[PDB]
């Protein structure tokens, strides 16, 4: 991206809830371009959040993502003699990418054999405020400001 400020590629609203964030997440679940098996998976998970939660799925999802968004993160930097981990706010854009990535990442790390479950459960665990996803977020922010000594290296 040396020339222009790479436009934020747009996305197609959901074939159900009609939301983009859903497609976004469904995409991160998809692997080898099997957008079907991906969508199915996510959707089955939405059913399970129902068969186990009074709230609609789409609402929980939003909730999960919301907790997993790291607001501060640290970025390595060269300081004429050393590499200092510098803390700085995480842009609204990167904020969401990180959230969705982490969810799928953590989820697929759970122990339940069925893929769809892991997502449903991870989402729920995220809604509550626990779970692997939400942890990475906590670890990240932990370092951010735990290096607040270099906040003056703005960047």
């Amino acid at each position: 991206a040396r020339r222009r400020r790479a436009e934020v590629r747009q996305l197609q609203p959901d074939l159900v809830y009609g939301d983009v964030l859903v497609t976004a997440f469904i995409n991160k679940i998809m692997r080898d371009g099997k957008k079907n098996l991906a969508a199915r998976i996510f959707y089955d998970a939405c059913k399970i959040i129902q068969e186990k939660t009074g709230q609609e799925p789409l609402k929980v999802f939003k909730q999960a993502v919301e907790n997993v968004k790291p607001r501060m993160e640290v970025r390595s930097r060269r300081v004429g003699g050393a590499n200092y981990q510098v803390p700085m706010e995480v842009s609204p854009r990167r904020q969401q990418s990180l959230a969705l990535r982490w969810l799928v990442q953590a989820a697929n790390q759970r122990p339940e054999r069925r893929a769809a479950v892991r997502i449903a459960h991870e989402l729920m665990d995220a809604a509550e405020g626990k779970g692997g996803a939400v942890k990475k977020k906590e670890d990240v922010e932990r370092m951010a400001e735990a290096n607040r000594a270099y906040a003056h290296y703005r960047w």
Binding site: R148, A149, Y150, A151, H152
Partner: protein
Amino acid sequence: KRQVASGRAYIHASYNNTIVTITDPDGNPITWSSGGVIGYKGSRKGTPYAAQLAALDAAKKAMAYGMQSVDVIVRGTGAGREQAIRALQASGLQVKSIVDDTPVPHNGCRPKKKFRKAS
């Protein structure tokens, strides 16, 4: 333990650390802090953050003594010099004033080589 509630705040900044000293109107220190005290060692101490932390330590520790209004007096141009002044102000302590007092010789002693280069 004396009940002052009105004194001075010396901020000694440098490129290596920042020590803050709170004292009574006469000039006698009540309590003090520094990047070192605050917790940082060597390199970190000079950082502007340590200065914020040490500034507040000076404040807190002095709050007990009953301190309420200080007269900030900056010295040196080290980094953190400003984050200190910053903290003191927004630490309850009513900052009555700020005053640079960094000493400067009217050309007295030959500086160390590291600081010469200026004939």
